[PDB]
Each structure stands twice: as structure tokens, then as C-alpha cells.
Amino acid sequence: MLRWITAGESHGRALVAVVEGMVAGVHVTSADIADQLARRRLGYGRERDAVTVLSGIRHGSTLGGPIAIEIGNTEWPKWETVMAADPVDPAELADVARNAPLTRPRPGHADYAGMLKYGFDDARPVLERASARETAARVAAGTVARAFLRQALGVEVLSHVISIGASAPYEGPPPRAEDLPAIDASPVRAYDKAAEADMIAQIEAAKKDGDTLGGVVEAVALGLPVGLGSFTSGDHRLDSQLAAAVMGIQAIKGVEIGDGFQTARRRGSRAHDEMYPGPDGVVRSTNRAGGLEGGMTNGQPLRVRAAMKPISTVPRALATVDLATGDEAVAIHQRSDVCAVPAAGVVVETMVALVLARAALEKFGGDSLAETQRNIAAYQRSVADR
Amino acid sequence: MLRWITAGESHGRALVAVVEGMVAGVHVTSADIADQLARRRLGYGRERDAVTVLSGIRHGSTLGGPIAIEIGNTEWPKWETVMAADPVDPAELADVARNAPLTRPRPGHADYAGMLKYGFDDARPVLERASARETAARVAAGTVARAFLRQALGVEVLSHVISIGASAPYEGPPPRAEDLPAIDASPVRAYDKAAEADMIAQIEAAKKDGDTLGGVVEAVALGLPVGLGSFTSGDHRLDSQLAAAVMGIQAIKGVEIGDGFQTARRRGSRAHDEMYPGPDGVVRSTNRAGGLEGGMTNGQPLRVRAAMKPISTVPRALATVDLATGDEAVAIHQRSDVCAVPAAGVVVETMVALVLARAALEKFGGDSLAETQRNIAAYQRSVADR
Ligand SMILES: Cc1cc2nc3c(=O)[nH]c(=O)nc-3n(C[C@H](O)[C@H](O)[C@H](O)COP(=O)(O)O)c2cc1C
Ligand SMILES: Cc1cc2nc3c(=O)[nH]c(=O)nc-3n(C[C@H](O)[C@H](O)[C@H](O)COP(=O)(O)O)c2cc1C
Numbered sequence: 001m002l003r004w005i006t007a008g009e010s011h012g013r014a015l016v017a018v019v020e021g022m023v024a025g026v027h028v029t030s031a032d033i034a035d036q037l038a039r040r041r042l043g044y045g046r047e048r049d050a051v052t053v054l055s056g057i058r059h060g061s062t063l064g065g066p067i068a069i070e071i072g073n074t075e076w077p078k079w080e081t082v083m084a085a086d087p088v089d090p091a092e093l094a095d096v097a098r099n100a101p102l103t104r105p106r107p108g109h110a111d112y113a114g115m116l117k118y119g120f121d122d123a124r125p126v127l128e129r130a131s132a133r134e135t136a137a138r139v140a141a142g143t144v145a146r147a148f149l150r151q152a153l154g155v156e157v158l159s160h161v162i163s164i165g166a167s168a169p170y171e172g173p174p175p176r177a178e179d180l181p182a183i184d185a186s187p188v189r190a191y192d193k194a195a196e197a198d199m200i201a202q203i204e205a206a207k208k209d210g211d212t213l214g215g216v217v218e219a220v221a222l223g224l225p226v227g228l229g230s231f232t233s234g235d236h237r238l239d240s241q242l243a244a245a246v247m248g249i250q251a252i253k254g255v256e257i258g259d260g261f262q263t264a265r266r267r268g269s270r271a272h273d274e275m276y277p278g279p280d281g282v283v284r285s286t287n288r289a290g291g292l293e294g295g296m297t298n299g300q301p302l303r304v305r306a307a308m309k310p311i312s313t314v315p316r317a318l319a320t321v322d323l324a325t326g327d328e329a330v331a332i333h334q335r336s337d338v339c340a341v342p343a344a345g346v347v348v349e350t351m352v353a354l355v356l357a358r359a360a361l362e363k364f365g366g367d368s369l370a371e372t373q374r375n376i377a378a379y380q381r382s383v384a385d386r
Numbered sequence: 387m388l389r390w391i392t393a394g395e396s397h398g399r400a401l402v403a404v405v406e407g408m409v410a411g412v413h414v415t416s417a418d419i420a421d422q423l424a425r426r427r428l429g430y431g432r433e434r435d436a437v438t439v440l441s442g443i444r445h446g447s448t449l450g451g452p453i454a455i456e457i458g459n460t461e462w463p464k465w466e467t468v469m470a471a472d473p474v475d476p477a478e479l480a481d482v483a484r485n486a487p488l489t490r491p492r493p494g495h496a497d498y499a500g501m502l503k504y505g506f507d508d509a510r511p512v513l514e515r516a517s518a519r520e521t522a523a524r525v526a527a528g529t530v531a532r533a534f535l536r537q538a539l540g541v542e543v544l545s546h547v548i549s550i551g552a553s554a555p556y557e558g559p560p561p562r563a564e565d566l567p568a569i570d571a572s573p574v575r576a577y578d579k580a581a582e583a584d585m586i587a588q589i590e591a592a593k594k595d596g597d598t599l600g601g602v603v604e605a606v607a608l609g610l611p612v613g614l615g616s617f618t619s620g621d622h623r624l625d626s627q628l629a630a631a632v633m634g635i636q637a638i639k640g641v642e643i644g645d646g647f648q649t650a651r652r653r654g655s656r657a658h659d660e661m662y663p664g665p666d667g668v669v670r671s672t673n674r675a676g677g678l679e680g681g682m683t684n685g686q687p688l689r690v691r692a693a694m695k696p697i698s699t700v701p702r703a704l705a706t707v708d709l710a711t712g713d714e715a716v717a718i719h720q721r722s723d724v725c726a727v728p729a730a731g732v733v734v735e736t737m738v739a740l741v742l743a744r745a746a747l748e749k750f751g752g753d754s755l756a757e758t759q760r761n762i763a764a765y766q767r768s769v770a771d772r
């Protein structure tokens with residue numbers, strides 16, 4: 001089974017992604033990874049040599065074994081003592097201001113619950129791993145998944161921003177793959193010019209007020225065959241798996257498949273996607289279901305929406321308690337941006353790609369790309385022969 | 387690790403739930419299971435001896451091994467040939483009208499994608515397993531989880547209905563455990579009398595029009611300790627795990643933790659739950675996060691909302707294709723109700739309970755309830771001693 005794991009602290013030496021269970025023969029390079037990492041940095045309101053492929057790829061082709069990708073920390077020299085792996089003289093450490101105690105947990109962040117859970121008197125060990133810097137390692141892994149999906153299935157994954165702050169949501173038609181350059185060129189990764197202007201204005205107002213914004217993003221996967229995922233149990237359903245992968249992204253508080261919560265307000269006669277005869281099989285005129293029925297891909301674009309909360313580190317830090325003393329306090333000062341919704345969209349693409357690649361390998365099997373491709377072709381033919 | 391699996395076809399001999407990895411010493415009986423199964427049948431707009439505990443429980447106490455619970459099918463005699471496990475003479479079968487071909491997949495259901503996936507020319511094998519009858523087996527498993535949560539942690543799980551059809555959503559405060567009798571006595575399992583009347587009216591109108599409705603439900607878990615789930619990776623986050631467990635319920639198209647999509651429309655200064663000193667530790671005046679931060683329980687009520695689509699089997703069957711011929715068709719006639727939202731709420735409680743019980747055993751360990759309880763107490767004391 002395809003599996004992915006990330007490791008690293010935000011201010012540690014490096015991040016590492018490991019992908020296991022990918023077939024041999026998938027073309028992917030350090031440049032591909034760097035390109036996707038650059039996309040994760042996109043957005044209004046927020047070193048390529050830092051990527052090193054350590055294992056599992058040779059001459060731009062996957063080997064079949066575990067793929068380990070390292071992302072170096074360019075500011076490691078500042079953190080090499082505070083985040084040293086090995087012991088440091090506590091006296092030396094005591095003189096380092098940067099090592100000062102972090103005992104005022106931020107509302108909305110992992111700090112408080114993680115400190116209690118792990119018995120830590122300091123937030124440092126929690127925030128270092130909880131930080132969304134970890135999504136960089138996710139994107140490295142996702143690049144391997146996305147290469148596989150393209151090469152094996154002709155599938156493309158993209159995202160666009162639906163709303164930021166109080167903007168009027170974009171409810172027009174979703175983009176296609178050919179639209180991604182324009183989307184990534186938008187300061188807010190919008191597919192609609194009116195929505196773009198509205199969102200930029202919301203960010204400007206928040207920026208002036210010293211506040212932060214969340215938003216809603218939609219990931220779209222195009223070209224999927226029918227029958228990835230299964231109805232046979234809750235955990236094998238693709239909607240279940242996608243919901244896990246997307247809700248587990250930092251700051252995501254909501255996930256929808258297709259029209260989601262709006263579907264719940266509709267009558268059955270107007271809520272589903274009717275089927276009609278077509279040249280090359282069944283066709284539909286709507287995609288309210290977002291490309292999934294009974295936990296399976298149904299031929300239509302997959303559409304997954306995610307709601308991101310506004311960043312919790314607000315420049316003037318919110319009210320909290322100093323756990324050292326029990327006193328009222330203002331929260332620890334940390335990384336804050338006005339809005340990270342466009343980047344959150346890119347992270348959603350990655351998690352969607354990983355889950356789709358896993359599901360594809362489950363159905364089509366194979367140990368090399370050519371093998372998997374033969375199996376895909378035979379299945380497609382069998383469906384066509386219906 | 388706590389694991390659950392369901393087995394059975396809707397019209398097969400019986401359903402089976404198996405729960406593995408539950409500690410010994412949890413008090414649970416066949417009557418408890420039957421009671422929860424009865425709750426799953428609640429709701430306007432839709433045999434206890436049928437429950438048999440086969441293994442893993444002795445004299446009302448779990449043994450520590452796998453717990454297998456059987457739910458018999460009272461109409462098995464009608465289906466004993468059509469759904470026979472063993473071969474039947476095809477000539478005999480050919481004379482049975484009930485065995486007629488089902489080749490007109492229902493929009494919105496598993497039929498089409500499942501038929502293509504598995505290479506079936508008939509929807510019968512798909513709909514039999516995809517059917518929400520399977521949620522009965524889930525509820526049997528969930529009963530074991532819910533007993534554990536109560537006995538080990540003093541935790542209660544309940545649900546109420548927020549909206550059905552075009553009703554004005556209930557946005558008042560959530561219920562407590564003591565409110566469940568009143569909720570379960572409501573025809574639509576509402577906690578608010580105005581919302582109740584509104585929802586009942588929506589159902590009446592849909593029923594008259596021969597249409598179906600979906601809705602939104604909220605599950606609440608009370609009494610949870612801080613620090614279940616973890617921030618250490620996406621898959622260990624409780625929000626991820628809950629999203630998987632809830633989205634994998636038949637007809638769920640959206641999941642929120644706390645204020646969800648509405649949170650995405652708020653400014654950071656008004657989106658999070660500030661912390662204040664209190665007698666027995668940190669207290670909060672809001673629970674916008676729904677009891678989770680950084681993938682961990684944070685002391686506040688857990689709140690999970692789920693959007694259920696209107697049932698897809700509409701009495702006058704929607705437009706589809708007959709896969710046998712390629713012709714336009716009306717969809718296969720099957721079980722339809724006007725609204726199953728109240729029952730969907732009960733199913734959400736079960737999936738929440740299962741995930742919470744698993745997370746609790748991950749942190750607190752133990753092989754018997756008394757052992758787990760000692761470990762819980764020691765952790766609580768260590769937190770108090772802060
Ligand atoms: C791309 C990305 C960037 C983020 N940047 C920040 C940030 O700069 N400051 C912050 O407080 N939270 C940021 N977050 C969110 C926190 O990491 C997150 O809220 C925290 O780990 C608690 O997890 P939860 O919000 O999922 O409960 C970011 C999230 C993502 C997806
Ligand atoms: C309690 C419960 C009862 C349901 N009853 C029906 C029903 O009677 N008829 C129907 O078409 N769908 C019913 N459903 C929904 C279908 O099982 C579901 O839409 C189908 O398996 C396709 O899965 P998906 O909607 O998750 O894509 C019910 C769901 C639940 C939770």
C-alpha cells in the first residue's frame with residue numbers, strides 16, 4: 001500500500017518526507033519537487049538547492065523502494081543550539097535568550113493541549129512539530145503521487161480559492177488543468193476576476209486592521225477512472241479517506257465533497273446527478289456529488305472543498321493563561337501572516353493526490369509503472385466493452 | 387489498537403459487527419446493544435431477539451478478545467433463495483421474479499460505479515452491501531465503544547438535528563447528556579421547539595410532493611480529557627480521524643469541527659477560543675473550535691457536524707441509463723424514505739464514539755478497564771498538579 005510520512009521540526013536541521021509503496025518507473029526529479037514547493041509559497045498576505053533526494057529515485061525514475069526527500073532549513077545556523085539534537089551545557093543554554101521559556105499558549109494553536117498531553121512545561125517542542133512548515137514535507141511526498149497520477153492515469157490535480165474573509169464566494173464553474181497558470185498568477189489563486197478583487201480587498205482591510213483571515217478552497221482532480229475507492233466498508237470509501245487527509249491539514253475545520261452542506265438544503269429531485277446515454281458511455285449534465293458516489297469515483301471531476309480558519313497568531317496576541325504562574329497573559333508571539341488560504345489550497349492538492357495514488361495502486365496493482373499501466377488499460381477496455 | 391469491522395448484506399441472513407482491541411472488564415449487554423439499535427430507527431419520515439452476542443463478553447463484562455455481535459434478518463425467509471450463499475439451480479432461479487435483473491443504476495447511489503468497478507452486470511451485489519442497513523452493524527460496535535467511554539472517562543456522546551430541508555438552522559447552544567431523552571422523543575430529534583416545528587413542516591411538504599430531504603446533524607461528546615489525538619502527524623490528529631469516520635457514513639457530503647465553514651468567514655480576533663484563569667485550571671467562554679486544537683481534545687465539548695444529502699431513491703425514480711441496452715431509463719425502484727436525518731445523527735454518534743474510544747486506549751493503554759482507569763487517574767492528577 002502507498003504510505004507517506006513526514007518528519008522534522010520547523011527550526012530543526014531539515015525536514016524529511018518518505019514515500020513507500022510507489023511503483024518503479026515513475027518519472028520525477030528534484031526540480032519537480034522544488035517547483036511544487038515553490039507553489040506552496042504562493043499568495044498575497046504571507047532555496048531550491050535545499051531539496052535533496054536521498055533514496056528511491058535513480059536517473060529521474062523511481063526504483064520501487066522507499067523514496068526519502070530532504071528539505072534543508074536555511075536558518076539552521078540560528079537554531080543549531082536551541083534545536084540541537086544532542087545535549088548542550090545547561091549553563092551555556094541559560095545564557096541564550098532565544099531559548100527563553102514559552103509558557104503562554106496561543107488560543108487556536110496546538111500549544112495548550114500538546115503541553116498537557118506530553119507533560120511539557122514549554123511550548124517549544126509542540127509548536128516546532130505542529131507548525132505548518134510540516135506541509136512542505138507533505139508537498140514533497142505529494143509530488144511523487146502527482147507524477148504517478150499523471151503518467152499512469154492522465155489525471156491532473158489543481159486548486160482554486162473560493163472565498164477569503166467576507167468575500168462573496170465564487171460559485172461559477174471549476175477550472176480545468178489548462179487554467180492553472182492563470183490561477184497561480186493570481187495573488188489569491190482565484191479563478192474569477194471579480195472574486196479575486198473582492199478577496200484582495202478583504203486582505204488589505206485585515207492587513208490594515210492587524211487581523212487575520214481564513215477562507216475556502218476547492219481542489220479538483222480531473223481524468224479519474226470509474227471505480228477507485230469502494231463501498232464495501234466505511235474505511236475503504238474515497239470520501240472517508242479524502243476527508244481524513246484534508247481535515248488533518250493544519251487549520252482545516254470543514255471538508256465537503258461536491259456541493260456539501262448546500263446539498264443538505266436541497267430536495268432529492270434536484271440534489272443528484274442524473275445519467276444519460278452518450279457516445280462513449282454514460283454522461284451527466286451536473287456534478288453535485290463532486291465525482292464520488294458510494295465512496296467511489298464515478299467518472300466526473302472530483303471536487304473537494306476545505307474551510308481554513310484564520311491564523312491564530314494575531315499580531316497583538318489573544319488572551320490566555322501563563323501556565324507557569326496561572327496568571328492571565330497575552331499569548332506567545334510567533335509567526336503570523338494575514339492569510340494563508342492560497343497556500344492551504346496547494347496543500348489540499350497534495351493530500352488529494354496522495355489518497356488518489358494510493359487508491360489507484362490498490363485497484364490496479366503492479367510493481368512497475370508499465371505493469372500498472374497494462375492493468376489500467378485492460379480495465380478501461382473491459383468497461384468500454386460494456 | 388481498537389478496530390471495528392462490519393459484515394453482511396441488507397437482505398442476507400444476518401449482519402455481524404466485530405470489535406477487536408477493547409479492554410476486559412467493560413460492562414455491556416445484549417440489552418444495551420438492542421437499545422442503541424432502537425435509537426437508530428428513530429425519526430419522522432421513515433425485533434430485539436435478533437441481537438445475539440457471539441463472543442468476547444461473559445456475564446455482561448468484556449473478556450478482552452474479539453467481540454462479535456450478530457443482528458438477524460427477520461425477512462430472511464423471503465430472501466433465502468435470491469441471497470442464498472450456496473449455488474441454486476439456475477433453472478429454479480430463472481423462475482423467481484425477485485431475482486429479476488437490476489440494470490438501471492440510481493443516480494446518487496453506489497450502483498453505477500460499483501457495477502463498473504467489480505464488473506457486475508447486476509446492481510444486486512452492490513446495493514446489498516452499500517445499503518445503509520450496514521449502519522446497524524456500526525451501531526452494535528459503537529455500543530461497546532460508548533460503554534467504555536462512559537465507564538473509563540465519564541464521557542457521553544449525543545446528537546441533535548440542526549436542519550432538515552429548507553428549515554432555519556438551530557444555532558442556539560448545544561444540548562447536554564440530560565437533554566437526550568427530550569431529543570429522542572422529538573419526531574426529528576431536535577433540541578429546539580421552533581426548529582422542530584419548522585423541520586416537521588419541511589418533511590410534511592416533501593412527503594406531499596413525493597420528494598426527499600437531507601439535513602445537518604451535530605454530535606457532541608462531553609467530559610473528554612485534554613490530550614486525546616496528536617499533532618505529530620496528519621493521521622494521528624483526532625480531526626482527521628473523526629472526519630474519516632463521519633464522511634464514510636452513507637450519504638454524508640460534509641463534515642465540520644466546531645463552527646467549521648462559518649469560522650472561515652471570520653476574523654482571527656473573533657474566531658478562536660481565548661483562555662482565562664479558573665478554579666480548577668484554564669477555562670474558556672467560547673467553543674468555536676469544537677473541542678479540538680492541533681488535532682487534540684482541548685477540554686471543551688467536542689462538536690462534529692455532518693451534512694446528509696437527501697435520499698437518492700426518489701419514489702418516481704430519476705433519469706438514468708439501462709446498462710444492459712444503453713437506452714435511457716428510469717432508475718431501479720428501491721427503499722426510499724422522505725428523510726433519514728435523525729437516524730443519521732445516531733450513526734454519527736456511533737462513529738464518534740468508536741474513534742474516541744480508540745484514541746483513549748492509544749494514550750491510556752491497559753488490557754483491563756481497571757488498569758486503564760488507573761492510568762487515566764494518574765494522568766489527570768499530573769495535569770491537576772500543574
Ligand atoms: C499553509 C499553512 C500556513 C499556516 N501558517 C500559520 C501561521 O503562520 N501562524 C499560525 O498561527 N497558524 C498557521 N497555520 C495554522 C496552524 O498551523 C494551525 O492552526 C495549528 O497547527 C493548530 O491546528 P488546527 O488549526 O488544525 O487545530 C497555517 C496552516 C497552513 C495550512
Ligand atoms: C440512516 C441511513 C439511511 C439511509 N436510507 C436510505 C434509503 O432508504 N434510500 C436511499 O436511497 N439512500 C439511503 N441512505 C443513503 C445511501 O445509503 C447512500 O446515499 C448510498 O450508499 C451512496 O453513498 P453516498 O451517498 O455516501 O455517496 C441512507 C443513509 C443513512 C445514513
Ligand code: NA
Nearest residue numbers: 174287301303
Ligand atoms: Na464539476
Ligand code: NA
Nearest residue numbers: 025368369370
Ligand atoms: Na515501468
Ligand code: NA
Nearest residue numbers: 560673687689
Ligand atoms: Na460547546
Ligand code: NA
Nearest residue numbers: 411754755756
Ligand atoms: Na477491570
